[PDB]
Ligand binder design. Structure first.
Ligand SMILES: Nc1ncnc2c1ncn2[C@@H]1O[C@H](CO)[C@@H](O)[C@H]1O
Ligand SMILES: O=C(O)CCCC[C@@H]1SC[C@@H]2NC(=O)N[C@@H]21
Lengths: 232, 69
């Protein structure tokens, strides 16, 4: 009844009135590739780097089962796939979201979505949380807030699945296409601080590593997880 | 036996506790590598005899992680 027309992602969706986490379920079950896990609300919502994620009713909380079979060197791009996928969906709904390295999409620098990718040997789980009509944390935003009115939940789903499927197929054709989309869609020129030097977030490399320009002019590359970063 | 690192990465968290009986293919610990949170599986059933690493530790391919009974 969903009327989806994709090749791999979205060929089967499994819906839950509620659940602890779509990502956990996706990981713990034997599911074909492209299967989507979607719940009205999650209670044990998860976030990148052991953080938590608010999944109140009215938003879109989903997980996609993927099996790309790609060199390790391309595995860092999967998170980008989801972010860019979201950016393109918001574009359809006339919302301008930009990427905050490397898993958050923002609108006027307020968080509206986040990506979380988990590994399970052969299995790869792409989790995406986007704020639609749900209630949100201070400093965050939603499509309903952005547009000032209720947004058709299904329509956002159909849209997003559709972009992620396309982006996935092209990723299997040339995993280098995403990098450009990201470079062309992420926040840049912002002075950041690394804890544990400071500089400018001027770019990413072919592994998705943030490229910081120090004040002297030297360059430093950041690996996600290895350091704490903040906007100034 | 000993379970070593399938790849380089920092330890996000340890799913199991010592003395805990493990299930083949079950989640032992999590490594953040290549922008993913990678769950490491048990090559065999068994018991957590030793947790060879800590959270926030940087491990490399082949480094010893868990020793089962
Ligand atoms: N539903 C949500 N919408 C926007 N931001 C969130 C949500 N849940 C958690 N966060 C924020 O995302 C960060 C982790 O990526 C946390 O610091 C948290 O404040
Ligand atoms: O910004 C982040 O820290 C990542 C948030 C990822 C949220 C989504 S909601 C669907 C999926 N299920 C989860 O438990 N987490 C992801």
């Amino acid at each position: 009844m969903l009327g989806l027309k994709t090749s791999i992602i979205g060929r089967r969706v499994i819906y839950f009135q509620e659940i602890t986490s779509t990502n956990e379920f996706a990981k713990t079950s034997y599911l074909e590739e492209g299967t989507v896990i979607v719940a009205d609300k999650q209670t044990m919502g998860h976030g990148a780097l052991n953080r938590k994620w608010e999944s109140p009713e009215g938003g879109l909380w989903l997980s996609i089962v993927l099996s790309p079979k790609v060199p390790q060197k391309d595995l860092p791009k999967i998170v980008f796939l989801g972010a860019v996928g979201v950016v393109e969906t918001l574009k359809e709904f006339s919302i301008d979201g930009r990427i905050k390295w490397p898993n958050d999409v923002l609108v006027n620098y307020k968080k509206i979505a986040g990506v979380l990718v988990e590994g399970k040997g052969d299995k790869i789980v792409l989790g995406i949380g986007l704020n639609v009509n749900n209630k949100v944390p201070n400093g965050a935003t939603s499509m309903k807030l952005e547009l000032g009115s209720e947004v058709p939940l299904l329509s956002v789903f159909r849209s997003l699945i559709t972009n992620l499927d396309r982006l996935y197929l092209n990723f299997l054709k040339n995993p280098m296409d995403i990098l450009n989309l990201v470079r062309d869609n992420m926040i840049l020129g912002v002075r950041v601080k690394i804890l544990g030097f400071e500089g400018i977030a001027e770019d990413i490399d072919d592994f998705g590593r943030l490229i910081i320009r120090l004040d002297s002019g030297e360059v430093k590359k950041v690996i996600y997880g290895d350091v704490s970063l903040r906007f100034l | 036996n000993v379970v070593s690192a399938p790849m380089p990465g920092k330890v996000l968290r340890v799913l199991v506790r010592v003395g805990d009986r493990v299930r083949v293919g079950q989640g032992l610990l999590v490594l953040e590598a290549m922008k993913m949170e990678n769950e490491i599986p048990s090559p065999r059933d068994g018991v957590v005899k030793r947790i060879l690493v800590k959270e926030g530790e940087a491990v490399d391919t082949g480094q010893p992680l868990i020793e089962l009974g």
